[model samples]
Target chain A: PTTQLEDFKFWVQYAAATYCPNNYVAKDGEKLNCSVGNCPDVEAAGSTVKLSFSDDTITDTAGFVAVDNTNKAIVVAFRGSYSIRNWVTDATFPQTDPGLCDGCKAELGFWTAWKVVRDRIIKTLDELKPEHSDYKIVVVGHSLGAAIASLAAADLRTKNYDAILYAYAAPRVANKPLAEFITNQGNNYRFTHNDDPVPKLPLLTMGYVHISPEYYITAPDNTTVTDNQVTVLDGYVNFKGNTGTSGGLPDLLAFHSHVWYFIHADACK
Target chain B: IPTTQLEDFKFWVQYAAATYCPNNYVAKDGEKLNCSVGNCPDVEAAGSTVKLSFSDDTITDTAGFVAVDNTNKAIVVAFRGSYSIRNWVTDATFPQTDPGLCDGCKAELGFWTAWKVVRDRIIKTLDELKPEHSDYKIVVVGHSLGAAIASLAAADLRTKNYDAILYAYAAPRVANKPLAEFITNQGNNYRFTHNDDPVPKLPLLTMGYVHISPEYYITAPDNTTVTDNQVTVLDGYVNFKGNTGTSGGLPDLLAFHSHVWYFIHADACKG
Candidate 1:
C-alpha cells in the first residue's frame, strides 16, 4: 500500500523515538530546550537522523533534521562525513601531508559513507512522496559532509530524484567539466564564511572557476548570524581577532562549514 | 711603509677589476659572457672564492662582484651560492649530495673543495704584491666570481700579515656574518645590492647572518664598469614588468627575503 503523508510523519517520528529517543518532555506553556550534547530522545532525535539500506546489515546514525511544512516542501539537513572510530577513539585528522592515512583514500571513504546515507534518505523520500512526486527536496551538509552531500545530490538528480543539494565549505569534488554539469543540473548552494579556510582548498591554477551556492551566513566574529544568502561572502577576512582564537581541528570542524542547519536554524525559520 | 690614500686606492683597483669584469667584458661587446664556469678562466679564478675553518667551509663561485674604492668604501654583487660539481672535480668536495655521502657531510665537503682554490689564490696574490707596498694598499673586488675573489682576498690578507680589505658584488658565500666580522675587523671594505638581483635569491636558509654594506651601485647597460659612484642604468628587473618612463617597484617579499649579502673590496672610485 502507498504510504500517506500522516503515515510518513508517524514513521519518521517512530524512527526518532526508537533510535534517537527524546528524554525531556516540554512542560505546559514552556519553550523547547535543546542543549549542545544533551536533550531527551525525541528532542535529541529532532537533531538526529538514521539510514538503513536493504543491502547493508549496519545502520548509519547521522545527526540531522527534517522540516516538512504543509506546503509539501521538505528540507533535509545532513552532517559531513566523519569516522565512526575516530569519533569514539578521540583521534583527529592530520592537517599536513604524510598524514596518518592516505588522504585520497580517506576522502573517498568519507564520500562512500555519505553516499550510503544519502541513498537511504532519497529512497525513503521517494517511497513516502510517490503521490506528490513533484515536491522539492533540499539537501544540505557542511565540510566533508558537504562534499558527500554534493555527490549524493548529483547522483539523485541523475536518477531523476529532482533534488537540490546545498553544501557549505565543500572541497573540490571533480574536474571542471563535471563540476559544470553538476552546477547546471541542480539548484546547488555553497555557503562559506569570509575567514573560513576550508573552502579555499585545492587552489585553482588559472582563471577563477565559480563554486556557486556560496553564502556569507556569519560575520567575522562567527558568533553573529547574518540574514544574507550563502553566495555573497568574501573569501578573506580577519579571522584571528573576530573568530575567537585563530584555528584548531575542533574549531575548524565547528566553523559552520559542517554545522550549517543547527547554526542557522533560526535563519531557516 | 705605505700612506693611507695609496693603500685605500690599491684595494679599489682590485675591487674595480672584480666588480666590473663581467659588465666591462659584456659592455665592450653586447653578450652574456660566462664568469664562473666555461672557457673564461680568468673571470672564473678572479670571482670564485671560499673560506675554510675548523668547523666548515664556504664557497662563492656564483657570487657576482666585489668592488672597493680609495675611501675604504666597498661593494659586493653576488647571485646564487655554490657552483655545480660538473664545473670542476676534486676530492675536497663531493660532486653531488648522493647516497654515498651523508646529508650533513655534503656542506663540509663543499667547503673543503672550494677552500683549496681560495687558499691557492690568496697565496699567489700575497706573493705577487710583495713589492707594491709603497703607494697603495691592495683591494679585491668582483661580481659573481669577483665577489668570491674579494672574500678570498680578505682571508688572504689576514693570513699574509697585510692590512688590506675587499669589496664584492653578487657573491654567494657561506657564513656571511662571520665573513663580515672578519672583513670589518681586518679593516676591509664592502657593499651590497638589493634590487631584483639573482644571486641573492637562492633557496638555502641555514647559513649564518649577513651584514650588507649600505653602498649601492647601478648596473646601467652602456657602461658595465664597477664604479665607486652610483649610476642609473636600465637593466631588466625581475618579477615586475618594466615601465616605459620610470623604474618598477621592488620584487616580491619571497625574492627580497632570500637575498644574501657579503663584503669583498673597498670603494675608492667613489672618492
Candidate 2:
C-alpha cells in the first residue's frame, strides 16, 4: 500500500543500516552502536541500533535490529552476501522444511541461516516490543541478507508479529508452494535492479522460486530513479523484468547489481 | 543459400548499395546508375530486380528499396545508411524507447523513430510481394545506420511470422540485451563488423544497448577481398575480441574506412 518512492526510500535507509559491521561489542561497560560504522543515512533516519549478531562459524549470517524513530518501525536489517563463508551458504541450494506452514520449504543455506539468527532476533524483539509496542517489524536485506530476511519475516508473521519484508536483489529462496505461502503472508517487496544478476540466481531448475509481484529497478546503479524507471511486475515469474539481464551466474559475482538499489544501497556512510 | 551466411555477405551488401540510388530510380540487372556510395555495381550481378524504391526527406531522410531475387528466390528489403547531416543527428540522439516488438525490448530513440518512418512502407511492400512469391525468403540488409534499421525490421517482421533473416554490415548496437537475444534466438540473423568499425559498438553498453549476434568480424584492410580465414566468427551478444576491442591503434576517425569496406567498398557506388 506504500508509494514506490516511500518504500524505495525505506529500503535505502535499511540498506545502510544492514551494511554496518556486525562486530558491535561492549566497551567500558557500554555497547557500541551503528555510529562506529559512520552510517549517515541510518542516523539521518533517526535509527538507533539495539542489537547486532554475527554467526561466523556455520551460517555466516549477520544482521542487526534498529528502532527507526522517524518511521516508527523496528528494522530487522541483514547484511547482503559477503565473505567466503557467507557465499558458501548462498551456494547451498538443497531444500529443507522451514516448518512455517504445511508444504513450506526454503533454500537449505538460507533456512539454517535464519534458524541460527532466529532466537537472537526473537529475544531482542521480546525485549524491544515492551517499550515500542506500536512499532511493526520491518524485515530488510539485500542479496543473501534479503534471502535470510525473507525467511525471518515469514516466521515472524507466523509468530503473530506484524512484520513486513523489503528484499533487494534477492535470489529465489523457496519452492512454489512455500513461495505462495509467503506471498499470502503479504507486504513482501522484492526489488531486482537493472543488470543485477543476483536476483536471477540459485537456479529455478533446482526448484527455487521467488515471491510474487517483483519491483524491478530499470535505471542503472547509483542513479536517481524515476517513477517510469521503477516498474512493479506482478506474478512470481516476471514477464518483462529482471529475468531479461544477459549475464548468467557469473554475473552474480559482479556485485554491482546487488549493491546498487535506488541509491548506493550498501554505502556504509 | 542463406543470404546471411559469411559467403553470401557480399550479395546482400550489393543490395544495400543499390539503396543509395536516387529515390524512384528504376534499377535493371546489369544496368549502371549514378550512385555516390559503394561501387555502384550493376546490382544485376547481385541477382535482384528493384520492384520499388522509396524515400522521405522530411524528417529522417530515410530511404530504401524493395526487390526480388528470382535466381535465389529471396525477397530483399534494403536500407541506405546515414547520408546527410540529418541522419547523423539521428545517430547522436541515444535515449532509449521500447521498439514495441516484444516485452521489455528497447531501442535507441532516433533509430526506433527512423525505423518507424520506413516501417509501414516496407511492410506494405512485403505484403504485396509475398502473395506472388509465397515461396520466397525475406532478407533484410543494411549498412551503418541502415543496419540498425534492418535489425529492428527483421525482429518486427519475424514476430509477425515472416521468414525474415538479417544481414547487418557495420551495424550499430540497436537494442538492449533481451531484444538482441530475442532477434538472435529467432535464428538466421548475421552481423558483420570490420576492423574497429566503431559503429557496431555504439550507443554504449552502459546505456544498456547490445548488438545482435553472432558477429562475423572482417579482419582484412578496406577495399580488399576477404578470405574465410580473415573473418572470425564471434558468438555472443557482446564480442570484445572483434571490432568492439581495441582498434589496433587505428584512430576512430580513420576507422570510417573500415566501415565502408566490408568486401569491396561497401558504400562505393561505381560502374
Candidate 3:
C-alpha cells in the first residue's frame, strides 16, 4: 500500500500543477485543483510504457519520459487532467472567444506552463544525461495538456533548440500564418475522442484548427463507452467551421460510417 | 628653299598616300595615285616642321616618325591639309569627291603620315646622336591631323618605349569615350583649335553633331583647344513657326514657341 504508484503520482501531479497550471482547473465548487485527478492513472499508464531509446533506458513516468536520442526525434503525448471544463477552457473556449481577455490569459497560461515543463525536462536531461544533448527535442500535448505542451515545445524551438509541437484540440494561440509557419517545420501529434463533446464547445472562436483523426479507447464489453466511443466527428477544421457545419464533415462521416457499418453490418451483405 | 620644301612636301605626301593605303589599295593604286592639292599643304606643313628632340639635338623626317629608339624618346606632330576629304568612303570618283574614301581613311592616312615623320625623326636622333636611351617620348598632332596623329601615336606608344602623346583639334576620329580615356592617361599636350571650321568639313559634310565635348579642353585648355564659334539652331522650330499662322496655327505656334522660347527664356530668367 505504501509502495503504491500514488507517491510518484503525487510528484507528477505536483509537477503538472506547478508547471502546467493552465491545463488544470478547480471542478465546480470542489476547490480541488484538477492536477490531483490527473496523476496516478496517467503516471501508471505512462510508466508501464517503455520507449526504446538509441542510448540507455529511461523511465516514461509522468514526471520523466524517455526522449529519443537520434537527431530530429520528437516525443508527443497528453498530460494533466482531462476534465471537461479544463479541456473546454484550454482548447474550445479560447478558440471561440479569442478576443476574450480571460480566454487569452488562459491560452498564455497554457503556453507558459508547457514552457516550464519543457525547460524542466531539458534541465533534467542536462543534469541526468549530458551525452545525448545533441538530439533534437520536441514535446506536444492534446486537449488541456496538449495546449500547454504545444506552447512549451514551440518556445523551445524558437530559442534555436530543434523542438516541435503537435498539440491536438488546443485552441488557436496565434494568427494563421504564424501558426502555420511554426507548425509547418516541426512535428506535432493531436488526437481526438469521438463523441467527447468537450472538444466542440465555446462556439465561434479562433485558434489552430486541429484536424487529426479521433481514436476510440474501447471497453472490455463489446459495448463501448458512448462518450469514449468516438464516431470521428468532423476532424479538426479551421475556426470558421466552429460555428458552421464542418467542411471536414465528409471525411468524418465516412470514418464514422465505416466504423458503424463494420460494427453492425453482415460480412456478406 | 620653298621649291625644296614643296618637293619634300610632294615626296612626303606620296610616301604617306602609298604607306597608309590598304595593301590591296596600294597594289591597285600604285604610281597612278598622288596626294591631292588640299591634302598636299598639310602634308608639307607636318613634314617641314621637325619635332626637335632637344635630348638628342637632331632633326628627323616623317618616314621614321613612328619608330622608337635607344633613348626611348620621339616627337610627333599632326597637321590638317586642305585637300583632305571629309567623309570616309571605299570607292573613288575624283580628287575632291573620292578623297580616297575620306572618313576613316582620311583620318588614318593623316595619322600614318604623321606617325612616319615622328618615327623618322626619332630614328635620326637615336642613330646620329646616340642619346643615353632615356625613357621620355613626345608626340604631337593638330586638328584633323591631330585626330589621326593621336590615334597612331597611341598605337605606337603601346608597342614601344614611350611616355606620352600631345595632340590638338584632331577631327573627332576615334569614338568619343575611347578618345577621352586614351588622351586622359597619355600625359601629353593635346590641344584643339576653336577656329578650325575646316576640320568639321573633312571627308565632306558641312556640319555634323559634335558628340565629344571640348570641356576637357576648357578646364585644361592647356591640354585641349575649344572654339567659341560653336552654334546651336532649332531646325524644326522654323517649320512650326510658319505653320502657326495658318488654320492649325495655335498648336504649331505653341509647340514652336515652347521648344525654343521656353528653353531660352528659362535660361535667361533662371527658372
Q: Specify the highest-TM-score model's number.
A: 2
Give the C-alpha lDDT of model 2. 0.72
Per-residue alpha-carbon lDDT of model 1 for A1-269, expressed as tens digits?
Answer: 54322232222222222122121122222222233322233243343232322212232324333434343444454443233222212122222221122231223433455555665576667665766566577665555446556666666676776776666556545434445666677477665554443454332432213344344444433243434322352222222221222231112212333223224221211
- For each candidate, C-alpha RMSD in Å? 21.6, 19.8, 35.4
Q: Please, what is the TM-score per model?
A: 0.32, 0.48, 0.27
Which candidate number maximizes lDDT?
2
Angstrom error at residue B247, model 3 = 83
Model 2 lDDT tens row, A1-269 = 77867667655556555665642322221222354443455666656678777676776667777787677888788874464222432244689998877887798888888888788888888988877999878998877889888888989999998788998878788888889999988999888887565676666777877898798988865577778888888877664778765533323223456566776655552
Ranking the candidates on DockQ from highest down gives: 1, 2, 3
Candidates ranked, most accurate by lDDT first: 2, 1, 3
Candidate 3 or 2, higher TM-score: 2
How do the residues B9-103 of candidate 2 rate in per-residue lDDT, one tens digit apiece?
76677777767666323454323323555354545654467776667677766677778878778888888755632225322347889878778
lDDT of 3 by residue, A137-243 (tens): 54544445455555555555655556545444443444344344444544544333332222343222444444233333222222323433333333344323222
Ten consecutive residues with minimal summed lDDT in candidate 1 chain A? A90-99
Question: lDDT, candidate 1, residue A10?
Answer: 27
